[PDB]
Amino acid sequence: SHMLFDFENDQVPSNIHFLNARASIETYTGINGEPSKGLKLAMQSKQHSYTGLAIVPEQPWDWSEFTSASLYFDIVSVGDHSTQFYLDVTDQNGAVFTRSIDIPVGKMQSYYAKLSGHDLEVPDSGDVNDLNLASGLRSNPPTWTSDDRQFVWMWGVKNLDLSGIAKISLSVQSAMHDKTVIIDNIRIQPNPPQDENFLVGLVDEFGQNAKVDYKGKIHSLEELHAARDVELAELDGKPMPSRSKFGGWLAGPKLKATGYFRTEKINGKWMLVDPEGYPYFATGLDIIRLSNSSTMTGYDYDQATVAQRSADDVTPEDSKGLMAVSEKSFATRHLASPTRAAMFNWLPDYDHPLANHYNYRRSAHSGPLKRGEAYSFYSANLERKYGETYPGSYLDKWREVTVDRMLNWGFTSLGNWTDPAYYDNNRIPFFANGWVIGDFKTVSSGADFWGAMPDVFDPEFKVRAMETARVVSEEIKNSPWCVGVFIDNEKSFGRPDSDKAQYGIPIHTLGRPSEGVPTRQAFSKLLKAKYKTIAALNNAWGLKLSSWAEFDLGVDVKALPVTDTLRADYSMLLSAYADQYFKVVHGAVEHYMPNHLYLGARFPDWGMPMEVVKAAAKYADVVSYNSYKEGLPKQKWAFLAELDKPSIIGEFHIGAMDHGSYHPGLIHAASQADRGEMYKDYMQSVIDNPYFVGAHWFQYMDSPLTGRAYDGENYNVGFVDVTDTPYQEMVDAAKEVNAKIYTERL
Ligand SMILES: [Ca+2]
């Protein structure tokens, strides 16, 4: 309806710019079967971590008349690899949204990204940290039916200023291979009418996509018991050959045995060493528990019947056990979200054998509900599969089968957020964790994502860190099977988008008075020692403060341009903040678990300023990073060499959309088989990096189709689906990697 680029005049448009990519116009077979001229985009994404194109018109495009329309592209990958494109669309006010999808090799398809209308109209809950759509799904089922593919929602602004679209970017990021696509028919089409029922009847009685059939979908209890029987016949509890008791490499050489997991460089490559002295390399899955397997039903209970949290609890609500819902709570049950309730084709009555799989969450990070009833279809399917030989017996069977799977699949560990009931399994090592939470004073990065940042100079922060480590130690029982302890996860230490974002903690804290703010008192002390006189600081910051006492009221550095002196100061303050965080946490872990490795705080790509990484290097035995990319690119990881610290990937994943999910997750594959190929590529990258001692995949099970209760993530990121059935493509990929982790490294 509004053609932007059909490439038929045989010219590479001059308004299109190429980032580490070569462009040409070629003839290819289009979506309708007919040859057409398209833009061939050959990205040098093996060598370069950011590649692609950007369309940047002279003056921003005015598409304000398109009140319910989408941007369309015909795209296909050529060659050996699928391509995950990030589509970023920026308006004249600098507002941006990001969508992404996999582009398979094979037949060209049409892809669309909504600009306006439909599920963009009431876009979410409002909250800036709410990345979901209004439904409480990270991405929705499409709002109409067609052969076309909808770009998946990732993050950003749902309603751009259509009167000025300034830039359209398609990029390939942190790839392990050169990617090549053909793009054609960049256009705008008004949206079809919104299907009234697009959020209705999404889920069947097994928690599966009710509207779509796919390979492996369960259609009966018989089919489920059949899948169960086939798998159980193959699981015999036997570890891969040449594994030591603790999952290490029997062939050796054997190093000094200390009785606990430890680190050591073995001929130029960092390794773990198991309690008996065998070289070790950690592989396994995160979230080996049921806590995150429930989805909001849209019902609520009258609050007099809900137990409230204890202020001294060390476990945040998201990581609590599934809450046993009482008959009296359930009787008070009432509709709070019609939209949520209508998604479910079946939910059990109080008297049904599957009614124990209800959950209640008293808080949420984001989504349409702040609290509510939830249901775990996965847990219900465990009961369906394994039945009861005594009350709760399906949970014990799930734990036994889980360990048997891990051993068959060749994993050397259970990863982070393993339920403490596995801690005495004594057949496979595990990683422990705790969270430091409590009523201690806080600071802010100015863009805190999961939660506010702790004031690590408040004595109560240390009190709570000590209680946290105490509880973990009680769980661990000083077991040699515990590889190490993660504390906290993806803290907002400062984002890399800008220098002010990066130094958000110094900027925000400097803005506050010293009185009552321990971290501000610490920052004030450091700057007094640096500058001595307020006059030196005035000239460094270009200010005219009358005294240290005025300085200590709080200073709005946020409005000042970042200069050399301000940068040096923010760097110094960030370092001191991060040093104190890691000092206190390490001290607590060491106090209660003196034998065990402390594994850091799991840095994401949006939260690893170097000042904080160097702080972790000082105190953590092993520095942890979560890295959702296609692998570990040379340039992005070159800093590791100067630190010379053993490192671990706490999280990665790849998902697909061919098994009923509305959202593949953070990194996208073309199919379950392609998921398996991409897994192998990622792990090869880890195996090849001499600083890494392991990598854990997030997570064991798919997230619920309609979103995990905590924050609406609804991804295909499991080694098993909602019916507890393994993706065999992922099993095979894991076995291939796990059979060679040691021969490769050693
Ligand atoms: Ca064309």
Side-chain angles (χ1 to χ4, degrees), residues 2-746:
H2 196 256
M3 181 61 66
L4 304 163
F5 300 91
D6 65 17
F7 309 99
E8 295 304 309
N9 68 358
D10 224 338
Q11 300 180 34
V12 176
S14 68
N15 301 329
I16 304 169
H17 310 269
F18 305 106
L19 309 213
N20 285 294
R22 297 178 168 96
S24 55
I25 304 296
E26 318 284 354
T27 298
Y28 77 99
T29 303
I31 58 146
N32 65 7
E34 309 180 18
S36 189
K37 304 270 216 333
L39 181 78
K40 180 185 179 159
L41 180 69
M43 290 155 284
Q44 288 76 63
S45 48
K46 183 175 180 143
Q47 288 305 309
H48 297 98
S49 70
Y50 190 95
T51 66
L53 61 80
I55 312 163
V56 185
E58 328 83 41
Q59 300 147 339
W61 286 289
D62 184 351
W63 300 331
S64 69
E65 80 264 34
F66 289 107
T67 64
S68 181
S70 297
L71 189 61
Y72 278 74
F73 309 79
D74 296 354
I75 323 176
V76 70
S77 293
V78 179
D80 289 336
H81 305 285
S82 68
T83 305
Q84 173 180 4
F85 258 154
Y86 289 88
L87 165 74
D88 290 278
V89 178
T90 303
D91 71 24
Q92 66 191 339
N93 313 298
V96 204
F97 77 66
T98 304
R99 292 197 178 240
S100 181
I101 195 62
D102 59 290
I103 315 299
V105 180
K107 274 66 160 306
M108 171 144 291
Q109 305 186 68
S110 280
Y111 291 87
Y112 63 94
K114 280 166 180 147
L115 294 173
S116 59
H118 296 207
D119 53 351
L120 300 186
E121 295 224 296
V122 174
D124 46 46
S125 68
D127 167 46
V128 63
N129 289 349
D130 182 11
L131 307 182
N132 304 117
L133 293 153
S135 60
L137 275 66
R138 188 56 51 94
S139 208
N140 272 348
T143 51
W144 63 86
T145 301
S146 69
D147 279 5
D148 301 331
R149 300 192 68 204
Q150 184 171 32
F151 265 94
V152 178
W153 181 251
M154 301 294 276
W155 42 76
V157 175
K158 275 93 166 192
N159 296 291
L160 294 186
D161 180 4
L162 295 193
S163 67
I165 299 309
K167 181 192 250 206
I168 296 170
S169 169
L170 283 170
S171 55
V172 162
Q173 300 177 19
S174 293
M176 300 288 103
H177 306 292
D178 288 343
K179 301 309 179 62
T180 303
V181 297
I182 311 302
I183 297 166
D184 196 5
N185 299 316
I186 310 188
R187 69 213 185 254
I188 296 159
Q189 286 179 200
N191 295 331
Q194 184 177 54
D195 168 16
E196 50 290 327
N197 295 320
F198 86 104
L199 295 175
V200 169
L202 300 180
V203 197
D204 74 8
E205 63 270 39
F206 301 110
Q208 313 171 122
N209 184 321
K211 294 184 188 173
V212 185
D213 186 32
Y214 48 84
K215 183 171 194 183
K217 186 172 175 183
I218 294 294
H219 300 285
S220 52
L221 190 64
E222 286 85 349
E223 288 184 1
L224 186 61
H225 287 164
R228 178 201 63 195
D229 293 335
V230 163
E231 185 186 13
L232 298 188
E234 295 147 31
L235 300 174
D236 53 20
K238 290 176 215 181
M240 281 192 167
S242 188
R243 293 307 173 70
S244 60
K245 175 187 188 179
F246 287 96
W249 188 237
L250 252 191
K254 176 150 86 197
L255 298 321
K256 188 166 169 52
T258 65
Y260 301 91
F261 283 87
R262 61 185 188 87
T263 64
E264 183 135 307
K265 219 185 291 175
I266 303 174
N267 299 132
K269 299 180 180 176
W270 278 107
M271 290 296 274
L272 292 154
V273 172
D274 84 9
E276 301 187 327
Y278 297 94
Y280 183 84
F281 184 91
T283 61
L285 316 179
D286 298 318
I287 312 276
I288 299 176
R289 58 181 188 187
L290 302 183
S291 302
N292 296 286
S293 72
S294 78
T295 189
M296 296 303 205
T297 64
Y299 296 81
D300 209 353
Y301 301 147
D302 280 284
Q303 301 297 111
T305 71
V306 185
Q308 200 43 251
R309 297 176 52 84
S310 153
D312 291 343
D313 194 343
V314 296
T315 305
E317 186 74 353
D318 67 270
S319 294
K320 295 281 281 177
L322 294 184
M323 185 188 289
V325 170
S326 73
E327 199 176 309
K328 101 164 191 286
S329 283
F330 198 84
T332 75
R333 155 180 220 270
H334 64 267
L335 202 58
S337 180
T339 299
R340 292 296 303 190
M343 307 172 162
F344 305 96
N345 280 347
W346 176 88
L347 289 170
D349 301 324
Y350 73 126
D351 59 24
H352 197 271
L354 304 170
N356 61 294
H357 304 282
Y358 280 113
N359 179 32
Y360 190 88
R361 288 310 194 210
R362 301 161 275 198
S363 61
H365 166 91
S366 61
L369 304 166
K370 299 213 183 69
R371 61 178 201 216
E373 172 195 88
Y375 189 80
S376 178
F377 288 96
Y378 183 85
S379 190
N381 290 330
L382 297 183
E383 189 175 338
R384 287 182 169 114
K385 279 179 67 163
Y386 300 131
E388 293 192 308
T389 285
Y390 50 86
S393 72
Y394 50 91
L395 303 166
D396 295 335
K397 181 70 159 176
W398 172 69
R399 299 191 216 108
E400 179 172 299
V401 168
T402 290
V403 175
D404 285 353
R405 286 163 159 172
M406 297 311 143
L407 297 173
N408 181 266
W409 298 348
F411 284 120
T412 59
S413 63
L414 312 174
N416 204 22
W417 302 296
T418 289
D419 184 280
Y422 285 96
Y423 286 5
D424 66 346
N425 81 81
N426 295 347
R427 292 156 67 208
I428 190 175
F430 62 98
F431 287 68
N433 73 276
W435 302 93
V436 183
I437 67 174
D439 296 320
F440 43 73
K441 286 167 195 292
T442 63
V443 298
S444 172
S445 71
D448 301 327
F449 190 72
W450 293 123
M453 289 294 283
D455 190 325
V456 295
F457 287 95
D458 179 0
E460 186 68 9
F461 177 71
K462 175 167 171 176
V463 175
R464 288 307 294 174
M466 282 293 286
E467 180 66 9
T468 301
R470 187 189 74 76
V471 172
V472 179
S473 177
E474 185 174 57
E475 299 182 311
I476 289 312
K477 303 183 185 268
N478 193 39
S479 180
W481 294 93
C482 174
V483 183
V485 181
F486 292 109
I487 298 291
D488 287 339
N489 176 70
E490 299 189 356
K491 304 195 78 68
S492 292
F493 275 108
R495 294 189 50 105
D497 318 317
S498 76
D499 286 308
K500 290 184 189 188
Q502 171 139 131
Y503 294 111
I505 294 172
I507 290 176
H508 189 279
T509 309
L510 282 171
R512 301 169 68 185
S514 298
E515 177 181 0
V517 189
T519 289
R520 181 52 158 77
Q521 296 157 21
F523 288 176
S524 181
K525 293 193 198 70
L526 289 165
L527 289 161
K528 284 163 192 179
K530 176 164 178 188
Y531 286 108
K532 325 290 177 177
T533 65
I534 195 62
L537 176 147
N538 278 328
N539 273 323
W541 290 14
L543 293 178
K544 298 176 309 140
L545 292 153
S546 64
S547 70
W548 283 115
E550 192 172 30
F551 171 83
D552 285 335
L553 301 168
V555 169
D556 183 26
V557 288
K558 170 169 38 73
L560 309 174
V562 194
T563 59
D564 294 333
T565 52
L566 281 174
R567 184 184 308 275
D569 289 339
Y570 297 161
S571 185
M572 165 178 86
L573 301 181
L574 191 51
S575 285
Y577 176 81
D579 281 344
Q580 178 68 12
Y581 172 83
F582 288 107
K583 189 181 173 205
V584 167
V585 169
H586 171 262
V589 169
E590 177 180 48
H591 182 84
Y592 285 105
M593 292 161 285
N595 303 115
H596 288 86
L597 299 170
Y598 159 49
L599 307 168
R602 314 165 61 78
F603 298 131
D605 73 340
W606 47 266
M608 53 185 285
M610 223 52 86
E611 291 91 344
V612 177
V613 181
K614 286 167 163 174
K618 191 174 193 307
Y619 293 102
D621 297 287
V622 179
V623 184
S624 44
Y625 308 91
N626 292 348
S627 186
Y628 292 102
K629 305 292 173 207
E630 293 179 27
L632 305 188
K634 189 180 169 149
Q635 293 298 132
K636 294 298 270 248
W637 296 99
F639 75 89
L640 294 173
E642 180 228 67
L643 299 176
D644 197 19
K645 289 287 291 191
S647 302
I648 189 175
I649 295 295
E651 301 178 12
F652 72 109
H653 64 44
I654 300 104
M657 307 172 75
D658 63 347
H659 199 89
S661 190
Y662 307 137
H663 199 314
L666 293 167
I667 294 292
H668 303 174
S671 73
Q672 292 307 132
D674 191 39
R675 280 180 89 202
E677 291 299 324
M678 294 180 61
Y679 175 97
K680 289 186 295 196
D681 289 345
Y682 192 102
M683 287 306 298
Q684 193 61 45
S685 193
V686 185
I687 290 164
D688 294 351
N689 186 308
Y691 302 100
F692 283 93
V693 309
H696 289 135
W697 164 286
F698 189 101
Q699 55 182 6
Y700 184 23
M701 302 117 59
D702 289 334
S703 316
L705 184 74
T706 52
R708 69 184 179 170
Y710 182 48
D711 72 352
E713 289 183 8
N714 61 341
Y715 304 157
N716 174 34
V717 295
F719 265 60
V720 301
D721 75 1
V722 69
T723 71
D724 190 45
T725 301
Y727 293 96
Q728 289 289 344
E729 300 84 352
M730 291 315 302
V731 173
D732 192 79
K735 295 184 174 198
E736 287 278 327
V737 167
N738 286 338
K740 82 193 210 187
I741 51 179
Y742 289 117
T743 52
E744 299 278 294
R745 297 290 292 190
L746 309 164

